[PDB]
Amino acid sequence: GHVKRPMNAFMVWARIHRPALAKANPAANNAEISVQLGLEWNKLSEEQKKPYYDEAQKIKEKHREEFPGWV
């Protein structure tokens, strides 16, 4: 609804990068770290974002293995 396809790719990128960013900027709280992750994500080129979108799609497909109709 409010969530669009970029968010799932961004969340892959964030899961990878948040822990080290939090430790490197430990005076910042989680909400501020989240803002910094979003700015870093938006500086990536379309080509750089591609593998995160590709991985988000693989994750989606793996989730759909739970559904009736898988195999």
Residue numbers in the entry: 335 to 405
Question: What do the authors say?
Answer:
SOX proteins are a family of transcription factors (TFs) that play critical functions in sex determination, neurogenesis, and chondrocyte differentiation, as well as cardiac, vascular, and lymphatic development. There are 20 SOX family members in humans, each sharing a 79-residue L-shaped high mobility group (HMG)-box domain that is responsible for DNA binding. The L-shaped HMG-box comprises three α-helices: α1 and α2 that form one arm of the L (major wing), and α3 that forms the other arm of the L (minor wing). Here, we show that all SOX family members, except group H, interact with RNA.
Due to its inability to bind RNA, we sought to characterise the structure of the SOX30 HMG-box domain. Crystals formed in 0.1 M sodium acetate, 2 M ammonium sulphate, pH 4.6, and diffracted to 1.4 Å resolution. Superimposing our SOX30 HMG-box domain structure on other available SOX protein HMG-box domain structures (alone and DNA-bound) demonstrated a very similar secondary structure between SOX family members, with a low RMSD. However, this is due to differences in crystal packing, with the SOX30 molecule within the asymmetric unit sandwiched between two adjacent SOX30 molecules, forming crystal contacts that stabilise the C-terminal end in this conformation. The seven amino acids at the C-terminal end of the HMG-box that we identified as critical for RNA binding (407-QPRPGKR-413; 73–79 HMG-box numbering) are not visible in the SOX30 structure. Structurally, the HMG-box domain of SOX30 retained all of the key features of other SOX proteins, with no obvious structural differences that would indicate why SOX30 does not bind RNA. Conversely, SOX30 has the sequence RPGKR, and thus has lost 40% of its positive charge within this cluster, which may contribute to the loss of RNA binding ability. Conversely, SOX30, which shows no RNA binding, features the sequence 70-WVYQPRP-76.
